[PDB]
Design a protein around this nucleic acid. Sequence first.
RNA 1: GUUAUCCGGAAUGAUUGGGCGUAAAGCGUCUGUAGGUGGCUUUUUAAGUCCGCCGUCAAAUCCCAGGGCUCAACCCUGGACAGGCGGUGGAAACUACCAAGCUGGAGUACGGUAGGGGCAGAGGGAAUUUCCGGUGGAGCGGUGAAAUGCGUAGAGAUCGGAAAGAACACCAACGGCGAAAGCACUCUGCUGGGCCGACACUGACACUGAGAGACGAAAGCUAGGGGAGCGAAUGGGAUUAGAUACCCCAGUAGUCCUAGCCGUAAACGAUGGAUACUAGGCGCUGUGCGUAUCGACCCGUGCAGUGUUGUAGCUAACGCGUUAAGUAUCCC
Lengths: 62, 134, 123, 171
Amino acid sequence: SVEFQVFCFTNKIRRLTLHLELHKKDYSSQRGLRKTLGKRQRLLAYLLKINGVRYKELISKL
Amino acid sequence: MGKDTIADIITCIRNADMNRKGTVRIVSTNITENIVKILLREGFIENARKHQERNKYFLVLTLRHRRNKKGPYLNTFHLKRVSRPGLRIYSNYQRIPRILGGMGIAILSTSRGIMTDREARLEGIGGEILCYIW
Amino acid sequence: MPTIKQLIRNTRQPIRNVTKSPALRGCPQRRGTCTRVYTITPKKPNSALRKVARVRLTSGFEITAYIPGIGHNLQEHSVVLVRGGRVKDLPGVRYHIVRGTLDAVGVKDRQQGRSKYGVKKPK
Amino acid sequence: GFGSKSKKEKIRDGFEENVVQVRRVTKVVKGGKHMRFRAIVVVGDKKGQVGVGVGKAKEVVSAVQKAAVDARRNIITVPMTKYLTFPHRNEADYGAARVMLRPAAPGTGVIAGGAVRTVLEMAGVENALGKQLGSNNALNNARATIVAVQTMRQFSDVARDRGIPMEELWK
RNA sequence: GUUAUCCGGAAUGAUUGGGCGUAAAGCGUCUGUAGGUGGCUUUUUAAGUCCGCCGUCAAAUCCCAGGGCUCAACCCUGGACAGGCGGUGGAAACUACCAAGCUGGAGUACGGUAGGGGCAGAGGGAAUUUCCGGUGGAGCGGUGAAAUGCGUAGAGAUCGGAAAGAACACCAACGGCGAAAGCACUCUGCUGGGCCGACACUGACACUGAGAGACGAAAGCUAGGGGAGCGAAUGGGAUUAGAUACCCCAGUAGUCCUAGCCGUAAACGAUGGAUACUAGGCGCUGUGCGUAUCGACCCGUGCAGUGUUGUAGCUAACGCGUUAAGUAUCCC
């Protein structure tokens, strides 16, 4: 299941970001946010590598 | 399952018999099957057996020995790769080498199949030299 | 240095055979003008009074050149012909002076190996 | 203590001897600084039978012959099939001296560095060419050739080992 | 003969052909773009690859074979392998491509699980110093030995009362976690990461990473707090020929915190990362299965991580050795 990985990582970045911006100095979870961004980004380049229209739907969903 | 499936088998051969263990377990892809098919019939090894463990067909390969010595195999096997991934080598039917005069063989990928120097020198075809053993 | 991309950028290159004579810079031996004909000492293990002529060259450099042989005629403002070759004992002397050539006479009374010192045959 | 060692020296027509270097190696003591002689002797008949040996003693000649008695218990035979040359090329390092040996045409006298050439001109091979890659040493050099010509196989024993009956050989 | 220039030797710029623990050399560690390399099966095109044929790469040179100068040098006649590029006809194993599946690589979902992972908030008690009281009266403190200091204005010692900042004894282990730096008084909150199982899911989504970005002990600096101890500089005493020093007594910046900058360390495992394979013994940590009881044990084990001796192999040696400095592949 791929779109649950992208969507799940998106909610991960939402909850972790609204953690981090009202907190502002945790330099440990910064790596977690950046590993999630990079991991999701290699997924988006993967599904963009496979398809057009379907990845256009992944952009249009979020 | 690393980068190479041929340094897979080959490095399992060198690491197999440099510790004198006369038994190899490797994956059985098409080109591994072809190499052990053109390698059991050339007297280097003894037997190759396919089987399965979790329905994954593998090759166990029995190496040669001799009798109770300081080391039970006298002639060290000396396997070597040539056409590395990222540096492909290619030869005509001129460059194709007689390894040590012929005591080694150079298994290589013709358009026919994969041959040895005997079976690609008579053909006159040439191709990508996988590796030569001696 | 992999075959891929650390080396089809470049390995590096060695510089040259570095010139063992920075003057003479065309080719082998070059006309000189004597400026000083002083005498200096070698490093610590040796002990001598080696007699060098600091010489201006026609190239554009000025350089202290050694004077071989025993006798020497070389006064102030004479003309010599320097050649390459490092005298080890003297710091700074890089060059020799040819003997028997222009305005630098051959050595006095030498009968072993004369072509290095510019002395014609006796007998 | 019978005397003069005439019968006991074994006149050495069977093994001809040469040094290849005699370096004076020295140790210091409380009294001072005293030296012994390390000689390296390569023994061998021209039949194909050589071996190195080191020795050291305060005399020169006892170090040479002492290295010889160490050497003439250390012999391999040279696999040299053809008209006094080599079956195939070989390379084998020992320590930090690497030696590439290469067979030659019969119109080629042995060309190698002094230690390698010494153990081959005593080995009775006539047609080889061996470059030395690595050390300036003489002992590990020569002993590296000895290891580089132990591991060398003819065509008859490779034909015997592989099981292939016979072809692919001009002679 | 000397000199100069060039190549060799020189594997001393390394594709053939080197290295990076300690010899010169692994970025401090990590994320990731470009780019490089990449699992298995089946099918398609042939760009690479290979084979045939054809065109051309002037002549001279070099190579072979003849011939001519009395030979040679040199001249001449004929021939051609390489190898380059192009046209064209074939092959499909490998790289690439087209399409379709696959799961062990990688993830996710789920259930557990361990932790000084991080940050924030609360709370804690020894100890030290200072102050305030009661006592008592001559030294206390310090040293190799002394002295400066403090002390009759009552020191130190002892008991009580406050206040202050900073650090957190035993537990502490050749232990756990983090990418490294680092992280230990306890509790709470938010939150990272790891490990293990079932097929529960997708189907190669992988590795590395130029430039880039982040973090990055300590000392340092800007701004504001705070300041007990310790303590560069400084000052005094001592030792000393001399002492700007080691010793001692005071002692400022600093040490701590807020917000930044700085971006270096023996940032060390003196060892970049990743995958696959190659004896064992003795351990520790986390989980999983079976035995044993039915419950804690306890034995073997499946893995992951951490350590100590050690076979093979490598190494100049010392040593390293499944967490390689082994065998190979990739990337910087």
